[PDB]
Amino acid sequence: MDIDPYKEFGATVELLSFLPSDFFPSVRDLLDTASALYREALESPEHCSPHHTALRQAILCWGELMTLATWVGVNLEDPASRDLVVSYVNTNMGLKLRQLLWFHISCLTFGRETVIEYLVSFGVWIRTPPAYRPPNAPILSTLPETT
Amino acid sequence: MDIDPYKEFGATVELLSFLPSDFFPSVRDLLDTASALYREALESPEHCSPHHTALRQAILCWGELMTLATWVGVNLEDPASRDLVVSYVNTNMGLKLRQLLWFHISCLTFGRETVIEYLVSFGVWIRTPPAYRPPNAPILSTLPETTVV
Amino acid sequence: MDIDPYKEFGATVELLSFLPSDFFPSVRDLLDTASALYREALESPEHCSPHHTALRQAILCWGELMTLATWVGVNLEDPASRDLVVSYVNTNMGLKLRQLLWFHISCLTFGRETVIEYLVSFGVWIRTPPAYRPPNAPILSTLPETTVVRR
Amino acid sequence: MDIDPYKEFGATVELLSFLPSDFFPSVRDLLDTASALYREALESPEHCSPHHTALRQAILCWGELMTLATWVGVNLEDPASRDLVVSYVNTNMGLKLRQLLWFHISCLTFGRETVIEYLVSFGVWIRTPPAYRPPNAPILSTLP
């Protein structure tokens, strides 16, 4: 019924596609980041933030797609069809999860607005000609500047 | 990460296992009900509650599987290998999502503590052997079966 | 009527004429920037500011030139002809749009006073011969020169 | 994206579609009216109203198409392809600026709201079957 997953949080699908698709880290680096930082809270019987609620659902959505990739690997007899189904899940469906996991993990770590301004800032930077922009790409950091 | 989806909301996967697998209505009837009632909140840019956030994720999860089910139909030329995947998505992967839509649609309606007491009460009814089991099961309602106005 | 696009906004064609062609992002990058940022304000039934009014007209102006560039591809037989027409639209006419889109997008994000002060200081830098000027052009950006968003 | 040009001002493309294409005056007649009445304001270094801003943009859009049409004449040797492009700009592309020039010149002259009821009133007239249709169409007039 035309739902935007980011609209609830103050973003859009268009705003996350304003960053290159290859910018977002892999699926496993994001799952290991959520499991390192957030695992105790994700497994809690508490809502915590709406980011936790959304992030719990995305991790479970991906687990069912990995069960699908496993199911395809065994059941389907011909390798030609197995590989087109597994490659679609890991790349095409993976990209939309990579954006969604990156978004909520970043909004938990760095704050939600910080991620929204970063996401506008980085996208303008990548479209600015190199001579007229700051030389180094934007990045998010929790490490305070020594002063 | 285990991540029981129901644990956040006061239930478990084992608590929703009191319901048979064939208890849950079709995904189509559940999406119709979410649209008929909750659409304008689900398209809304607020956090209305955690159930809304969970539906918004479950409805987009199902939308991606239908994009998959449509993508596989075009891009798999081998019919036998195509019909197995299109089925597995509509039936096997549908069941868990069809159980998850039922839960959050039932909690927005009827209240959440009523759905948890329904699962307990329905479990007593379904565990009862058929000889001793009453003819009418527990059911979620805001009104008695006969409404005189 | 001799009308200056920039003069109601506090600039001129001459003030923006010092920016080189390679300064501006492409048309696609500027359209996507206005869309990713200002789309709901650009599509709202309100006057948000004169920069919004001016973007709405520039965006639809480019939409007509792309309808032209598509019409030329379909209805012109001569391949040498359809190439000179499509290139003139994308290169020469698009360059004037890139300048116009960049200006209003920048004045929405940084404010018009900041953009005008940037254009004054950029001209001093660009008019200086290369030997006598700092090797890096002035930068107009939201980032504190080190990036590293923090907060 | 979408960007209805008229929705900012209280109209739409659906509402200006009540007017036929051949209703609108020529670009020349519209530019002569803007130059007569509005030129000192259009060339002013200030925002008079959003209709001035939008009308400045449309006059500059038409000027770039006339630079195009002048350019296409010189730099296209094949006359068969040359006149197709020139006749497309002066006719097909000019038609949509005719609508946009007409709309803002009318809202500066007669008022924004007056042009909105004129579009409604002209639609009632143009939809009336010919037998019952009054012989004179609605027209914008500042005479009280």
From Swiss-Prot, chain B:
Main location: virion
Superkingdom of origin organism: Viruses
Biological-process GO terms, alphabetical: microtubule-dependent intracellular transport of viral material towards nucleus; symbiont entry into host cell; viral penetration into host nucleus
Gene Ontology CC entries for this record: host cell; host cell cytoplasm; T=4 icosahedral viral capsid
Disulfide-linked positions: none
MF GO annotations: DNA binding; RNA binding; structural molecule activity
Post-translational modification: Phosphorylated by host SRPK1, SRPK2, and maybe protein kinase C or GAPDH. Phosphorylation is critical for pregenomic RNA packaging. Protein kinase C phosphorylation is stimulated by HBx protein and may play a role in transport of the viral genome to the nucleus at the late step during the viral replication cycle.
UniProt keyword terms in alphabetical order: Capsid protein, Cytoplasmic inwards viral transport, DNA-binding, Host cytoplasm, Host-virus interaction, Microtubular inwards viral transport, Phosphoprotein, Repeat, RNA-binding, T=4 icosahedral capsid protein, Viral penetration into host nucleus, Virion, Virus entry into host cell
Compartment list: Virion; Host cytoplasm
Subunit organization: Homodimerizes, then multimerizes. Interacts with cytosol exposed regions of viral L glycoprotein present in the reticulum-to-Golgi compartment. Interacts with human FLNB. Phosphorylated form interacts with host importin alpha; this interaction depends on the exposure of the NLS, which itself depends upon genome maturation and/or phosphorylation of the capsid protein. Interacts with host NUP153.
Family: Belongs to the orthohepadnavirus core antigen family.
Function: Self assembles to form an icosahedral capsid. Most capsids appear to be large particles with an icosahedral symmetry of T=4 and consist of 240 copies of capsid protein, though a fraction forms smaller T=3 particles consisting of 180 capsid proteins. Entering capsids are transported along microtubules to the nucleus. Phosphorylation of the capsid is thought to induce exposure of nuclear localization signal in the C-terminal portion of the capsid protein that allows binding to the nuclear pore complex via the importin (karyopherin-) alpha and beta.
Protein name (Swiss-Prot/TrEMBL): Capsid protein
Location of this fragment in the whole protein: 1 to 149 of 183
